[PDB]
Amino acid sequence: QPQVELFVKAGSDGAKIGNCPFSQRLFMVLWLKGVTFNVTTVDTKRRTETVQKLCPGGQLPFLLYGTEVHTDTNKIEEFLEAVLCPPRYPKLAALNPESNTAGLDIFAKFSAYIKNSNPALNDNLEKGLLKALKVLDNYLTSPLPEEVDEEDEGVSQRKFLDGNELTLADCNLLPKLHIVQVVCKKYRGFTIPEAFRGVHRYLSNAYAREEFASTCPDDEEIELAYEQVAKALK
Ligand SMILES: Cc1cc(Nc2ccc(O)cc2)nc(Nc2ccc(O)cc2)n1
C-alpha cells in the first residue's frame, strides 16, 4: 500500500481543521475505505516549502498517493474509489445515480442566501433554500428500488441517500449540509424545518457515524469562515 497523505485547509490558528467541505468529503472517503492515511493541514497563507513544491498551483485540498500529487476533489475521489477497491477495501459508489444528484443544489442556494446583503431578497433566498431542502426531503422519503413495495406506505425507512450504508454521495452532501446548518443557525435565525422528517432522520443517522461527526471542523471555525459575508445583511 503506497503512502496516502491528504492535504487539507487549516483554520484560524493555521493548524487545526478549517472550514472546507471538499477537504471533509475526502477525509470521509478515506475513513470509510479503512485505508491507513495521514492528514496534513495547510495554512494557505503560510505554506511550507514541501507543500509549495508538491502543489505549486495552490489547489486545496490535494492528495499525495505514493509519489504522485492529485488535484480536483471530484477526480481524487474517482481515483480513490478505483484504486482502493474490493476485496481489500469497500466499494463506496452509490448504486442509484439519482443519489449522486439529490440535494446538490442546496449548497448554492445557501451561498446565495448567506452572501446576500439586499434586505428585499432575504425571504426569496430563504424560500429558495427551503425548497431545495424539500426536494432532498422527497428523495429521502421516496422508496429506492431496493425497497419496492416493502412501516408506512410510500415512505422510505433507509438511513442514508442510497441505502443503509454511507456512500460517496453522502461524503459530498453531508459536509455541505453541516455548513448550511451551522452558518444559518448563527447568522440567519434559520433551522431546517422539523416537518422535513426525511432530512432530520438522515442527519440523525449521519451524526451517529464517527466518519461524518469526527471529520467536521469545529463550529467556531465554520462560523469564523462565514462571518464577513453573513454579517453584511443589516
Ligand atoms: C454535532 C451533532 C451531533 C448530533 N448527534 C445526534 C443527533 C441525533 C441523534 O438522534 C443522536 C445524536 N446531532 C447533531 N445535529 C442534528 C441532530 C439532529 C437533527 O435532526 C439535525 C441535526 N450535531
Site to substitute for ligand 1 among 184, 196, 207, most atoms within 8 A of C-beta: 207
CA distance 9 to 23: 7
Report how far residue 228's alpha carbon sits from residue 115's, in angstroms, rounded to the nearest whole number. Answer: 9
Amino acid of residue 45: K
C-alpha cell at 213: 461527526
Give, for ligand 1, the residue of 204, 205, 210 to mutate: max count of ligand atoms closer than 8 Å to Cβ.
Answer: 204
Q: How open is the CA angle 170-4-214, to the nearest 5 degrees?
A: 40
Q: Which domains does the chain have, with CATH numbers?
A: 4-83 (3.40.30.10), 97-230 (1.20.1050.10)
Task: Tell me the C-alpha distance between 126 and 193, whole Å.
Answer: 12
| Residue 2 CB coordination number (10 Å) | 10
Cis peptide before 21 (omega within 30 of 0): no
Q: What distance in angstroms lies between residue 203's CA and the mean position of ligand 1's atoms?
A: 6
| C-alpha cell at position 128 | 429558495
Strand order across the 4-9 sheet = 38-42, 4-9, 62-65, 68-70
| Atom of ligand 1 at shortest range from CA of 192 | 21
Separation between Cα atoms, residue 10 and residue 107, nearest integer Å? 21
**CA 132 to ligand 1 center in whole angstroms:** 21
Q: Where do we find the cell 426531503? A: 137
Give the residue from 28, 37, 47, 10 showing the smallest Cα distance to 166: 28
Contacts 24+ apart (CB under 8 A), 13-17: 14/43, 14/45, 14/46, 15/41, 15/43, 16/41, 16/217, 16/218, 16/221, 17/41, 17/217, 17/218, 17/221
Amino acid at 138: N
| 184 has binding-site annotation | no
Q: If you measure from the C-alpha of residue 177 to the centroid of ligand 1, how many angstroms do you get, rounded to a whole number?
A: 12
Distance 107 CA to ligand 1 centre (A): 19
Half-sphere exposure (Cβ direction) of 16: Cα atoms closer than 13 Å: 12
Looking at residue 10, the DSSP 8-state letter turns out to be B
Cα separation, 50 vs 157, whole angstroms = 48
Using the Cα atoms of residue 99, residue 101, residue 102 and residue 103 in order, give the sign of their dihedral.
positive
Instruction: Give the technique used to solve this structure.
Output: X-ray
* CA–CA distance, 198 with 156 (Å, rounded to integer): 8
